[PDB]
Curated annotation (Swiss-Prot), chain B:
It comes from the Eukaryota. This is Glutamate receptor 2. Induction: Down-regulated in the pyramidal cell layer of CA1 in the hippocampus by global ischemia. The chain holds residues 192 to 303 of 883 of the full protein. Belongs to the glutamate-gated ion channel (TC 1.A.10.1) family. GRIA2 subfamily. It is found in: Cell membrane; Postsynaptic cell membrane; Postsynaptic density membrane. Detected in forebrain. Detected in dendrites of neuronal cells. Expressed in the pyramidal cell layers of CA1 and CA3 and in the granule cell layer of the dentate gyrus. The gene is Gria2. Ionotropic glutamate receptor that functions as a ligand-gated cation channel, gated by L-glutamate and glutamatergic agonists such as alpha-amino-3-hydroxy-5-methyl-4-isoxazolepropionic acid (AMPA), quisqualic acid, and kainic acid. L-glutamate acts as an excitatory neurotransmitter at many synapses in the central nervous system and plays an important role in fast excitatory synaptic transmission. The lineage of its organism: Eukaryota, Metazoa, Chordata, Craniata, Vertebrata. The postsynaptic actions of L-glutamate are mediated by a variety of receptors that are named according to their selective agonists. This receptor binds AMPA (quisqualate) > L-glutamate > kainate. It comes from Rattus norvegicus (Rat). Glycans are attached at E65. Homotetramer or heterotetramer of pore-forming glutamate receptor subunits. Tetramers may be formed by the dimerization of dimers. May interact with MPP4. Forms a ternary complex with GRIP1 and CSPG4. Interacts with ATAD1 in an ATP-dependent manner. ATAD1-catalyzed ATP hydrolysis disrupts binding to ATAD1 and to GRIP1 and leads to AMPAR complex disassembly. Interacts with GRIP2. Interacts with GRIP1. Interacts with NSF via its C-terminus. Interacts with CACNG2, PICK1 and GRIP2. Interacts with GRIA1 and SYNDIG1. Part of a complex containing GRIA2, NSF and NAPA and/or NAPB. Palmitoylated. Depalmitoylated upon L-glutamate stimulation. Ubiquitinated by RNF167, leading to its degradation. The M4 transmembrane segment mediates tetramerization and is required for cell surface expression.
Amino acid sequence: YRSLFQDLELKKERRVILDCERDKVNDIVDQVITIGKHVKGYHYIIANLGFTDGDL
Amino acid sequence: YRSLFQDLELKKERRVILDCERDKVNDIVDQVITIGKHVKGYHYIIANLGFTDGDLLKIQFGGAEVSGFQIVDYDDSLVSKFIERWSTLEEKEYPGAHTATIKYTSALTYDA
């Protein structure tokens, strides 16, 4: 995942729409937390009906 | 703390030297994690002898550069002879011992 978002920084993306399970959503966001792409400038969209189910 | 670093963003500081206990260091860094000031552009310095005692994996890959001081270097074989005994110590008999590393306060207690 640290390889993955670095490859997203090859395009320097700020706009990532996730399509994962509620566990796999929370696992990757914790990796976003680890690298700090939850800061201003980024935008994320969670593509499920359980937007309130995750850890916000 | 979210009020505090926002007040640091009134000056827009990037250079914060912490002076806290090992728990209170880790508590505030987790608030830095919560706001994301562990990213590149920031620099932090931990002002204790236990720089290796804290949790460095939480902010190793964020971007800020973290510095500190260590009096108990684990690369010494004399320290490594202690560590090879330290991890094999019973936690139930010696509480806090069955670990990979040691606090410097516990090391200086053994040094005393």
